[PDB]
Design a binder for this molecule. Sequence first.
Ligand code: NA
Length: 140
Amino acid sequence: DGYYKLVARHSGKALDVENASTSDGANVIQYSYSGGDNQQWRLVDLGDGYYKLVARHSGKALDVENASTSDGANVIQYSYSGGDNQQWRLVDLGDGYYKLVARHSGKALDVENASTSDGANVIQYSYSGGDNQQWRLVDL
Ligand code: NA
């Protein structure tokens, strides 16, 4: 495809733009994989190990809301403008999983509280090896 699904290790559920909204600011969540275009991501190499992740349905990018550097800052989709809060380091963890670390904050893509529920919020948080902070990049 050129596209990937990103599946959280703990839940087996996919990185998802909520309700397939194409809007700037639409929330990014975890949700059971259905093959929806809002659950498919283009991994675009920016060099130096950084990538932008672009949702297939909207062409908008994985974005840490307002470039907050806090543990727990929200992850959303937003039109790409080259912000460091829209660039992600894809780090191979050694066992088939990755962490994705936001360039501006050094914080990892994280399913809040390791919830396995559909609709659990995706945020950033310091990496501490939780399975809710590890992602399988599955080639579509
Ligand atoms: Na989110």
